């Protein structure tokens, strides 16, 4: 009875450690995605100041407009996965506390 | 500051001598290297502090 509690506790320990590594990786992923929005927006901004007839709606313009929206969609997906990861880590911490209280008794 | 002074003084070259030369390329690359190496030293100092 207590041996199974100890084994489940050790597996919960491994899972919460790996979940911490996963949420650190998610943070590193969403931090890195900012620079692509940097590049797309500073490409779009300096091409607004081309001369009179040269202000042309090239397919690069539409592609750079699509750039911002797809990068934003990626960032929103990563934020939702961050919230899901935090919820899973919280559930793991609750199971940790319950198993520790069980092992105390 | 030496490179910044050399950049500011060389703009005052006169009307037909405002020319991109080897010195301009080398000076701009030196200022870029200075800035990159400053940021790298700052981050390494932060790592040492941690």
């Amino acid at each position: 009875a207590k041996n199974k509690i100890q084994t489940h506790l050790a597996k919960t320990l491994q899972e919460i450690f790996q979940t911490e590594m996963t949420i650190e990786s998610i943070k590193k992923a969403i931090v890195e995605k900012s620079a692509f929005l940097k590049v797309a927006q500073t490409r779009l901004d300096e091409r607004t100041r081309r001369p009179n007839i040269e202000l042309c709606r090239d397919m690069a313009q539409l592609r750079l407009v699509n750039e911002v929206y797809e990068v934003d969609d990626t960032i929103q997906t990563l934020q939702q996965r961050l919230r899901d990861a935090e919820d899973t880590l919280q559930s793991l911490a609750h199971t940790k506390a319950t198993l520790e209280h069980d092992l105390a008794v | 500051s030496i490179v910044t002074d050399n950049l500011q003084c060389r703009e005052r070259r006169q009307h037909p001598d405002l020319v991109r030369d080897c010195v301009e390329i080398e000076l701009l690359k030196e200022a870029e290297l200075i800035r990159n190496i400053q940021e790298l030293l700052k981050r390494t100092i932060k790592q040492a502090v941690s």
Binding site: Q41, T42, E46, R57 | -
Partner: protein, 49 residues
């Protein structure tokens, strides 16, 4: 008439060269170049002719 046509022609080449400079800077703008930044609302601004 030849001079007027040549002038209307030459004033197009300055715009071509200015656009060449702008798009050559924008094409060489990778991640961590030195000076990429954030311009809020620039993805929907379109003053095109």
């Amino acid at each position: 008439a030849n001079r007027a046509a040549q002038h209307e022609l030459e004033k197009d080449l300055s715009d071509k060269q200015s656009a060449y400079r702008i798009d050559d800077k924008c094409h060489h703008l990778r991640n961590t170049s030195d000076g990429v930044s954030y311009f809020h609302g620039v993805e929907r601004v379109d003053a095109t002719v």
